[PDB]
Design an enzyme around this catalytic site. Structure first.
Site, PDB file in Angstrom:
ATOM      1  N   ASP A  53       0.839  -1.108  -0.246  1.00  0.00           N
ATOM      2  CA  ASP A  53       0.084   0.118   0.001  1.00  0.00           C
ATOM      3  C   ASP A  53       0.945   1.306  -0.047  1.00  0.00           C
ATOM      4  O   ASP A  53       1.997   1.024   0.318  1.00  0.00           O
ATOM      5  CB  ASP A  53      -1.022   0.192   1.244  1.00  0.00           C
ATOM      6  N   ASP A  55       0.078   4.891   1.702  1.00  0.00           N
ATOM      7  CA  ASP A  55      -0.896   5.876   2.331  1.00  0.00           C
ATOM      8  C   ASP A  55      -0.300   7.253   2.564  1.00  0.00           C
ATOM      9  O   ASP A  55       0.874   7.210   2.953  1.00  0.00           O
ATOM     10  CB  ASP A  55      -1.619   5.151   3.501  1.00  0.00           C
ATOM     11  N   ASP A 112      -1.585   2.901  16.152  1.00  0.00           N
ATOM     12  CA  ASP A 112      -1.322   1.922  17.233  1.00  0.00           C
ATOM     13  C   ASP A 112       0.171   1.502  17.320  1.00  0.00           C
ATOM     14  O   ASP A 112       0.556   1.413  18.555  1.00  0.00           O
ATOM     15  CB  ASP A 112      -2.222   0.403  16.660  1.00  0.00           C
TER      16      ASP A 112
HETATM   17 MG   LIG Z   1      -4.624   0.509   3.547  1.00  0.00          MG
END
Ligand SMILES: [Mg+2]
Ligand SMILES: [Mg+2]
Lengths: 388, 388
Positions: A53, A55, A112
Site C-alpha cells: 500500500d 497511504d 497503534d
Molecule cells: Mg490501507
C-alpha cells in the site's frame, strides 16, 4: 531521541520505489501543503521489501483536499481520509488528527504500533520518527504506543493486530505490550462480531495463518474468537482436529505465497469439521434419529453458535454447508450421480477436505476414497464410464 | 385415408404425460378456439420418451391470442408464434398457416417432416395424421413433406435437419428425400454463417454428434460446413485428426447423456487442432519464424477460414485460442509458473485436449504430461510443492 532521519542515513527508501502516489504528493506539495508517506509502505521500504500500500497524510483539510482534486477520480466518503483512483492502484489521502485536525506529531500518537508509524517526505527525503520506530524496526519489535492498558480498553482489536504483525514480520512483542493481552483478551467479546470476522481473515487468511495461530494460542486470543473450537482441544496436544487446523493453515498459507486464490468458506469448513462430527455423534446416540437428519442438525448448531462470535456472512456459511454435504455423498461409493457431483461448484473444495480428513486421521480407507476421486476427475470420459 | 386416430389405438399419448401447458390449451378451448399439440412433443410421446418441449398451435389470430392472455407472462416478438412463461417452462403458441393463415390441414403442409407433423388435442384425445405421419413413425422413416427438390431450394437447412433427426431418432432417410441431398449440398453456402453456426451445434453438440457425423459425411453435407477440415481428410481413414474428431464427438455425446455442462469452444478447438498444427508448421519453414510467433499466425489463419462458413462468436474464438495456447505452456516442463496455469479458467479444457492428443497419437511423450498434470492437479500443496 532522533526526530529526523536524512536519506543518507536511512535505508534506501529510494524515491524510485514509490510507484506514483508521487503524483498525488507533488500535487499537494505544489499547493502549499505537506505530503507524508505513512505506515505500512514506509515500514516495508526501510525494511527492504516491496510496499503493498501507499497511504499519505497532510495538513490539508479534507475539504481542501477536495478542491485540489475535484478534477480527479475520488472514490467515495469516509470522514477525513480521501480515496484517489488510478485503477489497480488506489491511494489513500488522510488529514492529520489531534481540536479534530492537527500536526504531524499529534497524528503519530493515535497510531497503534511503532514501525507502522514512520513518515516519509518526497519533499525532503527525510523520515520522521516521533516514536520508537527506527530502533523498534531495527531490533524487530512490535511495541504499542500510548499506555497499553488503556489503548487495549479503548479498542481491544489492537490486541489482535499486535499478534498479526507479530507473525507477518518475524518480530517479537515488547514485554509491556505483551503483559496485558492474556488478561484482557476476553475483551474481544464486546466487539461487533462483524468486525471480528474481518480480523479473523486478516489473521489466518493472509498467508501467515500458521505462525499467527501459534501466537493467537499463546495469548488466549484464539479462544474468544472460536469458542466452539477451543472446547475440543486436548491435553495430549495433537488430536485429529488439532492436526487439521495446523495443516489447513499451513496449506492455505502455501497457496497464498504461490499466489493462488483461496476460499475462506473452506478454511472454516476445515476447522469446524471435527466439532461438527462430534455434535453429530451426541445428536444421534442421544435423541436417537437417522445419521443424515442428525448431521444436518449439527450443522445448524455448530454454525449458529460459531456465527455468534465471528459473524460469518450468509454466503460463506452456505458454501460451508455444501462442502460438508459433499463429505457424506462422496463417502458412499456409487455411480451415475458421480457426474452430477464432479460438476458441483464446491466439489473442488469438498475433495480437498476429504484430502485433509484422510491425511490427519491416516485412515487408509479414506485415503482409499481419495485415490478413487483423484482418478475419476482427471480421467477422460470413456474411463470415467468404466469406473462405475 | 386414415387421418384421425383415437386414444386407445394410438400409443396413448396420455393426458397425464403432458406438462401443464394443458392450462394454456384449456383457456383456448374454453374460449372457442381449438388447440393442438405438435411435432417435437407429440413425436416423442407416441414414441414413449419424455418430450423436451410442448408447442401448441391454434386458429386464433396472433391478435386474438395476444388478447386472451393479457393476464399472463407472455414473452414478446416474432410474427405468429407467441410465447408464454411459467417457471423453467415456456410454451410456444403459434397460429396455423395457409390470405396468410387458415385450416389445421393447410398448416400440416408447411412443416418439414412427417413425424414432426402429427397433431394432438386434449379436447378429444385423437391425434390427426394428414401425412405419412403415424405410419412413418412406426416404420422408422424421415420423409420430407412436399417435393424434396423444391423445398430444399426454398430452405437448404431442411437438409441438415433431415440428417439430424435421422441420427437422433434411430431411423432411415426415405429414398425420395435422400436423393437430392448430395447434389444440393452446396446450396448451404448461400446461407448466413449465423444460421450454419446455430445448426452446427444442434447437430454435433445435442449429444448425437458421432452418428450425426457419420451422416453429414455420407451426404457431403459435412464439407460446406467445415471446408477447412474436409480438406485434411485422408483415404486411409485413420489420420490423427480423423481419430480425434471421432473421439471428441463420442465423448461430447457421453457428457450429454450424463447431464454435464458441455463446452462449445472445446469441440472446435479439438477439431481444428490438427489443421492448426499443420498450418503452423507450414508457416514455420515456408517463412523462418520462431515457432511461437508462427503458431499465433496459424491461429489467426485457421479461424478466419472457418469463420467464412460458420459464424462462430467472438466469445468462443477467444476461449479456443486460449485452450490451444495452453497446449504449448503445458508442454514446457514449467516450474513455479505452473500454479498460475492450474488456475486458468480453461485449464480443464486444455487438459481434456492434451488428454485426447495423447490418446489418438498413441504417443508416449505426451501420454506422460497427461499422467503428470493429472496428479499435480489433484494433489495437495505439500505434495504439489514437491513435484516442482
Ligand atoms: Mg490501507
Ligand atoms: Mg421450439
Amino acid at each position: 531521541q532522533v526526530t529526523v532521519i536524512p536519506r543518507e542515513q536511512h535505508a534506501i527508501s529510494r524515491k524510485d520505489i514509490s510507484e506514483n502516489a508521487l503524483k498525488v504528493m507533488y500535487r499537494l506539495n505544489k499547493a502549499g501543503y505537506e505530503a507524508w508517506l505513512v505506515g505500512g509502505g514506509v515500514r516495508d521500504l526501510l525494511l527492504g521489501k516491496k510496499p503493498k500500500d501507499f497511504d499519505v497524510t497532510t495538513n490539508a483539510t479534507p475539504e481542501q483536499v477536495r478542491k485540489l482534486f475535484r478534477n480527479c477520480r475520488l472514490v467515495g466518503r469516509r470522514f477525513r481520509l480521501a480515496h484517489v483512483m488510478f485503477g489497480p492502484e488506489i491511494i489513500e489521502v488522510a488529514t492529520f488528527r489531534g481540536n479534530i485536525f492537527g500536526s504531524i506529531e499529534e497524528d503519530a500518537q493515535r497510531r497503534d504500533f511503532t514501525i507502522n508509524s514512520l513518515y516519509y517526505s518526497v519533499a525532503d527525503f527525510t523520515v520522521r520518527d516521533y516514536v520508537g520506530g527506527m530502533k523498534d524496526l531495527k531490533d524487530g519489535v512490535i511495541r504499542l504506543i500510548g499506555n497499553p492498558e488503556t489503548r487495549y480498553r479503548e479498542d481491544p482489536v489492537r490486541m489482535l493486530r499486535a499478534v498479526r504483525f507479530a507473525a507477518k514480520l518475524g518480530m517479537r512483542i515488547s514485554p509491556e505490550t505483551a503483559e496485558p493481552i492474556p488478561r484482557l483478551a476476553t475483551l474481544l467479546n464486546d466487539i461487533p462480531p462483524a468486525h471480528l470476522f474481518e480480523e479473523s481473515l486478516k489473521l489466518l487468511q493472509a498467508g501467515y495463518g500458521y505462525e499467527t495461530y501459534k501466537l493467537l494460542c499463546e495469548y488466549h486470543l484464539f479462544q474468544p474468537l472460536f469458542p466452539t473450537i477451543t472446547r475440543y482441544f486436548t491435553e495430549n496436544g495433537d488430536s485429529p482436529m488439532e492436526r487439521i487446523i495446523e495443516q489447513v493453515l499451513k496449506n492455505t498459507d502455501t497457496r497464498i505465497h504461490n499466489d493462488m486464490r483461496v476460499n475462506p468458506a473452506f478454511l472454516f469448513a476445515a476447522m469446524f469439521w471435527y466439532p461438527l462430527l462430534e455434535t453429530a455423534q451426541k445428536i444421534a446416540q442421544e435423541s436417537g434419529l437417522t445419521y443424515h437428519d442428525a448431521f444436518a442438525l449439527a450443522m445448524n448448531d455448530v454454525l449458529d453458535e460459531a456465527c455468534r462470535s465471528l459473524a460469518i456472512p450468509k454466503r460463506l456459511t452456505t458454501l460451508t454447508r455444501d462442502i460438508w454435504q459433499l463429505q457424506l455423498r462422496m463417502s458412499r461409493r456409487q455411480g451415475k450421480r458421480a457426474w452430477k457431483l464432479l460438476e458441483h461448484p464446491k466439489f473442488r473444495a469438498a475433495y480437498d477436505l476429504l484430502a485433509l480428513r484422510a491425511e490427519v486421521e491416516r485412515n487408509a480407507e479414506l485415503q482409499r476414497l481419495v485415490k478413487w476421486w483423484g482418478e475419476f476427475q482427471v480421467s477422460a470420459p470413456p474411463d470415467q464410464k468404466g469406473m462405475l
